[PDB]
Paper text:
In conclusion, our investigation into the absence of WD in C. elegans has revealed that while hSARM1 ectopic expression in C. elegans neurons leads to axon degeneration following nerve injury, the ceTIR-1 does not. Together with structural and enzymatic studies in vitro and in cell culture, we have determined that the stronger NADase activity of hSARM1, particularly its lower Km value, is the fundamental reason behind its ability to induce axon degeneration, whereas ceTIR-1, with weaker activity, fails to do so.
In stark contrast to that, the ceTIR-1 TIR array is readily assembled, without the need for NMN to release the TIR domains from ARM inhibition and without NAD+ involvement in stabilizing the TIR active array. In conclusion, at least in vitro, the portion of ceTIR-1 particles that do form ring oligomers are assembled in an active conformation with the TIR array pre-formed even without NAD+ and mostly free from ARM inhibition.
Author numbering:
A (entry chain G), B (entry chain F): 194 to 695, 707 to 849
Write the structure that this text describes.
Amino acid sequence: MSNTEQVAMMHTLKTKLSKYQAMMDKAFEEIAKVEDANIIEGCTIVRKLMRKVWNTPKVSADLANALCDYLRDRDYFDKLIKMFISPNTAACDQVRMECGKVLEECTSSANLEYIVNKSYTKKIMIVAMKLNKTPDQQRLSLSLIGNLFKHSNAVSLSLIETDVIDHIILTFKRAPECPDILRHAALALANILLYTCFEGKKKIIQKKIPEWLFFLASQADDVTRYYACIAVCTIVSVKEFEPLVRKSDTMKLVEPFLQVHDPATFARDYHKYAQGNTKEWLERLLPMLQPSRRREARSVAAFHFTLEATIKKEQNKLDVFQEIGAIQALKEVASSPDEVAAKFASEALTVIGEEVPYKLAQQVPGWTCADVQYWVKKIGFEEYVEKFAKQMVDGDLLLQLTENDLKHDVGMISGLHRKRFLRELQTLKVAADYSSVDESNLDNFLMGLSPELSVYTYQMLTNGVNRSLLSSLTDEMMQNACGITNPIHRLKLTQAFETAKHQIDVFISYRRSTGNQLASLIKVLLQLRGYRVFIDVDKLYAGKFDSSLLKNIQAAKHFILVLTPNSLDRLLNDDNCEDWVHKELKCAFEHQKNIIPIFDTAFEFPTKEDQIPNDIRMITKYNGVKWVHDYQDACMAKVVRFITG
Amino acid sequence: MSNTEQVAMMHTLKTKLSKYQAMMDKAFEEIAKVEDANIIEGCTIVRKLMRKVWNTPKVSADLANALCDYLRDRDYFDKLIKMFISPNTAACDQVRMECGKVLEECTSSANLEYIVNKSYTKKIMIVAMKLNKTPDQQRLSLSLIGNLFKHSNAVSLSLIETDVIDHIILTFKRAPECPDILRHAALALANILLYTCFEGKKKIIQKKIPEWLFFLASQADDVTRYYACIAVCTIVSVKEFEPLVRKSDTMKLVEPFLQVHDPATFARDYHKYAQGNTKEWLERLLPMLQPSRRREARSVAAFHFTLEATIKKEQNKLDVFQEIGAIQALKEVASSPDEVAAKFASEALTVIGEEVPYKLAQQVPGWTCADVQYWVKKIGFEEYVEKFAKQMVDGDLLLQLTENDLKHDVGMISGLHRKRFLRELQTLKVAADYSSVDESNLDNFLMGLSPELSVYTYQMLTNGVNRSLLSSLTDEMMQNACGITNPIHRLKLTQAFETAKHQIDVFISYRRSTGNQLASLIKVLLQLRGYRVFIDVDKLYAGKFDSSLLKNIQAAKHFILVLTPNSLDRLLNDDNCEDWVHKELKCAFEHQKNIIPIFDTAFEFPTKEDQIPNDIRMITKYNGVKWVHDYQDACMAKVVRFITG
């Protein structure tokens, strides 16, 4: 499998993770409504998504795992557990069903560990035992039960205390008409046997489980038979229980069942149930290959490891068999006289092949020059690798590259070759993880905004940009400092800040008939001293009378009221606030403007002050400037003092 | 056939598909009225279009198929089915007829599969059996019947349960006068026999069908005879049924009927009926070439395969005979002592010739360097191919090319060579599918806007443009980022975003005798300022006063009122809205015009403002301009400011 494919996988993973995180959040909004149909629909969407994820060509396992992690990280998993185990869920069993199905999809090793750490284990087990009303409930029950049985020996042994084995027996005995029940039963038995001590195995066997595994291995369903063969061969792998399985006759079915199948053919049937098979479950199956075990057990183990090798080739994770050392046991079995086992082991070793030179870390800033060399080589620029080495290019340096650097320091002459190269580098830039350095999850943010914007991450990050600062950038800063020359991309992120939401110094109020002199004079005089001073002289707009007359007051810090003879007279009995000086002054009072009356020399307050409306009457008590034409400069200085405080 | 022709075909296909999709939509808008003449006319147009499509020089089959797909995709096909089978259609059987004729054109393999998937099959069958009232009904009936008989064995067998065979017999027996009836009968018999199991074949034969096929093969019509010869030779190809045909002279007619024709002459005759001939129908005919079958059956099969080879040469799909392996059976027959069959088989093999090196995928971004090399070669740039290879050019890179890249990295020195090359590349760009990457069918949108604009698709798509954003682009973004340097093309898409929304600009209201000279001057001054400004004097014609006065206001955005010594006067107590200035101003308010009073130099509002009707009273509290004759230019500047903000 190529480095182009390593990149494509990483890229796809990051991309679809970002996408499915968002879609999962939407589905979790329907869950978080806490309404039956919405929880059902949300869980249905999550279920569909998780299955589609598992059906994704090769990143399926990683993408499933990452979403299982995200479910824990978001507490979505915790919420599902609570909204499954809660007795209130009896209001609609279909809510419990959909929650349970999702939990089934999400029962990763780390999710089961979470369940154990939070001690939900027995609650979930009992609630699975309560899921019994229909074959669907029974299948889901046996599934969740069997999934709990993928945790360590102590947990399985603790769960034996529930006597769920008898519940399992009764479940398949009730509804053998469903092959999927027989599958989930045989699965549960395989899992518990694989994940239990000698004592617990003995307790399981006492429930006539070898004879029930004979029953299961006698069914028409190859997946049930596969699990039944694994389960009995797990028992057979223990010396003292071989006679009990011999008495069950199941070993006599085992090898013929394997003989009439091929692991890779069975893989295509088994895929739906192969999804979620894991390293520690392989580590526990590995002992069944050993020459100490029965030919039957060795044959099952060999067939199984070939099947897994097939799947792990597709996943590009054949390394697991080297990590657990299974390759040695396969060689032993391939050399053994157990022809069936030896064939399957030889076939498994045929699938094993050879290692990758490097698995590249998605944290590409951490790349050594050796990594860059390998990448460059594999993307088909071999003749330049020596020059990259000579230039001592590293992960960080790659991310900074421009065509000039190629043109000059790499000496890479073809513009076309540069285009080609840069396309790969852009792909890589998008694909790369930055969480190594991105404290702010700016990468995640950009991906969410649009995936390609990932390309800019490292530049802006290294310029010291972070997720909080994005609000504050000009198109210039973006374009130049962050190098986002594409205006389309700039527009996209601009839309984020367009959607992230949701001055006058002095207003002059005056009498239009008489304050006209003093007010505009004040306007002009204040325009000397650098104040923005505004007044309804020469300015009105937008048709129906301009509400600017109050908006301009709201924007103003200071409110000057010109008081000329009889200026206040029309405010008398203006209780309906019809007078515009009233509207202006009321607005000033409501918005706590720094209000200054300026008294013309001839001004006098109205005799009937009590007739001034209550909301504005306070103006008769206010702090103001008696305007004296003789002392205009001093009067204006006083006005400025009231403005400056 | 050249790659230039592959491109021309692909181009034409994409082009005419876009066109005929739009035309089909128009016809479907007539159908969607659910009114007899509109359904009839729409279906008539679709029928004409489908026949014209079938008459299209090369791409006929693909274009027909793509439109059959589009019909399903648009649910147009579903609508036709419903509007055919519905009992309400008995209101006008001509509706059912036109729907049925269109369905006949549109009964591709996938369309028949749709019918089967939706279980409409028996409903359509029975309704076809009800189409019996005229020779036209009978022909269409036998057609739809025969078309249903081109689905797989189980469907044909299920339709035998209707005893439609007796209906078929009675139909042609009723109307022997019509060659087209005899054709659709012989077709239905050929199809059902070709698409049925042994048991169903036996049931068909029991309806005296060999003797009816004698009758049909005895008729003067060569197309009826062809189908009759195929039908009997289908029966003759089955061991137990040779005597059931041999009871009749039909095999004795068969070879002489072939002998007096040439497959290519018959192709030109049969064309009308040669349309729609599937691979699957060929796959079922292939066994009739085998040396196990009669000389008659081998002769029919050989003649037929020559005829089909003739048509598939024209359609550029000779590959079918390699895919189904018919070439081997033709070689066997060509080697056989069946001289007539051997001649036709030799002629068929003469037509077969040799394969194309590549059939290019219209998804040209997916092209390998090998594909580009092949393209470059075939467009007549062979001497550069090695340089393209050396430059490692791919599908994506081709789409990015500029003359600079040719000039430098290809070292294509002739500007003329570049022009020539770019012309082909533009053609290819237009022709190419992008749906591989275009989530939004922006390609389709651009094509619909104008086909050549396809040229820009890949650039803007790779810049991250999508169908939603197009509204929002500046001429700069278009020109520069999207590279649409042709302003004409920019204008075209500008028209699209103009018409993504949705003349007198300013109306002048006045009291006639006092707005007068000023009102007129306002028109003149605003016309000097470029506004199309009109007045009460101008816009009264050939009818009632209101009915010409007011319409100007709705089309205007801006509404000036000249306020004057009798402006508002006649509005007082005008509760019945009798005053024309009232009607004008009310209309302005109702349609939210940005209304601006212009106060004459000696203007006063009515002090008895409370007598102004409530719907227009707001005008006394409006943003206006005091006209002062001495400052006419400043006043008009102010008017412009109120208009523009």
